[PDB]
Amino acid sequence: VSDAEDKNVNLDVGKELPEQLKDDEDGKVNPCDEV
Amino acid sequence: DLAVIGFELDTRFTNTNRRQRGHLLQTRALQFRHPIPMHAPVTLPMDTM
């Protein structure tokens, strides 16, 4: 039951953004390089 | 009536003009995806006292 620090509140949802969404899907392969 | 009536040859072209390509080679890749599910738990129901 802590007091909130309501006086001046500044949120940053980008910091909480899951690491999954910070980049694209990583499955990509150049078949010509691997074979 | 015994006679030779026809024949077949084993002749072939030379592809000095690259008329034929035959088979073609192209690279491919397949991807499989296996996400891991959760499973039902096992619980130990102790008393709270």
Side-chain angles (χ1 to χ4, degrees), chain A residues 14-31:
Chain A
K15 290 179 180 178
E16 295 292 352
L17 185 71
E19 298 82 357
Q20 291 176 91
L21 296 175
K22 293 181 181 180
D23 204 352
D24 208 348
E25 199 270 330
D26 58 337
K28 181 177 182 291
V29 61
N30 183 335

Side-chain angles (χ1 to χ4, degrees), chain B residues 4-24:
Chain B
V4 177
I5 63 170
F7 63 99
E8 292 183 326
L9 304 175
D10 204 34
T11 55
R12 64 189 68 194
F13 285 94
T14 56
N15 286 304
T16 59
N17 63 12
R18 304 285 297 274
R19 177 175 293 290
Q20 300 294 337
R21 294 181 293 169
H23 293 291
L24 312 175

Side-chain angles (χ1 to χ4, degrees), chain B residues 35-46:
Chain B
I36 298 169
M38 294 178 71
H39 302 280
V42 178
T43 300
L44 176 65
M46 292 179 71

Side-chain angles (χ1 to χ4, degrees), chain A residues 25 27 29 31-32, chain B residues 27-29 31 33:
Chain A
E25 199 270 330
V29 61
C32 291
Chain B
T27 60
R28 294 289 186 273
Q31 300 183 305
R33 191 167 298 273

